Amino acid sequence: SMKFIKYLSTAHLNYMNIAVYENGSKIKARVENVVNGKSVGARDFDSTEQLESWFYGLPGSGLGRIENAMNEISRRENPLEKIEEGKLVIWINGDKGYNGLAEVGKKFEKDTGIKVTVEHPDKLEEKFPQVAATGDGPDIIFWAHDRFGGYAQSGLLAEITPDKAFQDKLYPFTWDAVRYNGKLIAYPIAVEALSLIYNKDLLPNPPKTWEEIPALDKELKAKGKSALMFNLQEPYFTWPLIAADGGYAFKYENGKYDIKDVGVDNAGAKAGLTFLVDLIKNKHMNADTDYSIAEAAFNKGETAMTINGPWAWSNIDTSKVNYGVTVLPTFKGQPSKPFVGVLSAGINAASPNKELAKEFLENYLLTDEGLEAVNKDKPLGAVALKSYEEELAKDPRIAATMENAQKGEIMPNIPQMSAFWYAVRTAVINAASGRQTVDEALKDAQTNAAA
């Protein structure tokens, strides 16, 4: 879906260039490190013609104009469309099929004359609670369900009330993910869980255990390859290893979560992160690997494995790597325990388009045809819609997604999940980079999560 076409500049500036991709039916241009593929920024374009007209229209010339292009593409991507009556503004994260969703918007616009804009503003899930509070932001926000309880607690979300027959179309556990204080606060879309992704040409049988990875990396470095690369910057990707042997966010009792019973600093969590840091101290992995570096390395056949969600699969299809999707490795004999997210669509309490939003979500998006259009852009994984899931469940990659999900946990949607994530992210980066030891990083994470 992300298919490389060319570098824009004939000469690399400071080992940076602008990588131009065919992105489904659109174009994406990224400011990339030409050595490790690290992406510094990106913007979408309708077509190569629009890309060039934009580029030929920038100030400067020669390499100076490339630089200006890089500065424009690499600066923060801010919300552009403002809420208006008779329009829908949608925010969804940049790794999801937002062009497919826009196509669902076009079906809505054809039927109703209401235009539907889709954006992926940077840090949309942080921008939302600050601007929706004051009447701005989008009509509809997409994120995994863990963010939504914080939003609901602050009054930022309309209560959603699909009728019983609509509720019967989605799996009951996906409704539970978006239930907060006895109210539905979002429409569940898809069920996400990390899986192990491996190159069958480098690795016909993936390791069952994390403990095999150091030896695997040893023999692959000899052939100039890596065993495993994945995004070390976001705790979502490292959590499954941290949870495997006992780590948890909040203990869920008979009825509720106990925000005072935090488990980011127990023996299991310490063991998982220690194994992670040991991979780095032994140079099997690099503390600076982010999402783009790992993706580029795996899709070019430089590393035998990665850890990612379904939103990444079609990029690998395009790369033509002979890949498999399978259950995460065990740690200490215990299954890796990924946090399961339910991609969910909430309606802004400040939206003046609440009935149009409901109509868009229920009768356009949450249909076999609507989800397929999104899925064709970036795969959704398992979907909350039973009719569509029963067809997707025949795909072994979906079966593997659900196996990892079943070995994991649905994320809590309580307000403090935000604090938990921020604390675990700081703990992993500090332990990975050697700014802190494992024990002292997880001790601080313990503190920051429960406050």
Ligand SMILES: OC[C@H]1O[C@H](O[C@H]2[C@H](O)[C@@H](O)[C@@H](O[C@H]3[C@H](O)[C@@H](O)[C@@H](O[C@H]4[C@H](O)[C@@H](O)[C@@H](O)O[C@@H]4CO)O[C@@H]3CO)O[C@@H]2CO)[C@H](O)[C@@H](O)[C@@H]1O
């Ligand atoms: O300033 C530091 C960083 O702060 C911001 O990131 C925060 C988010 O605001 C928090 O919400 C949380 O993020 C969670 C996320 O809520 C959770 O759903 C999951 O995200 C997955 C997602 O489900 C999946 O579909 C796919 O998109 O991958 C996501 C993981 O990247 O896990 C997140 C935690 O890793 O915590 C993060 C900080 O870690 C801000 O957005 C960052 O840009 C900023 O650097």
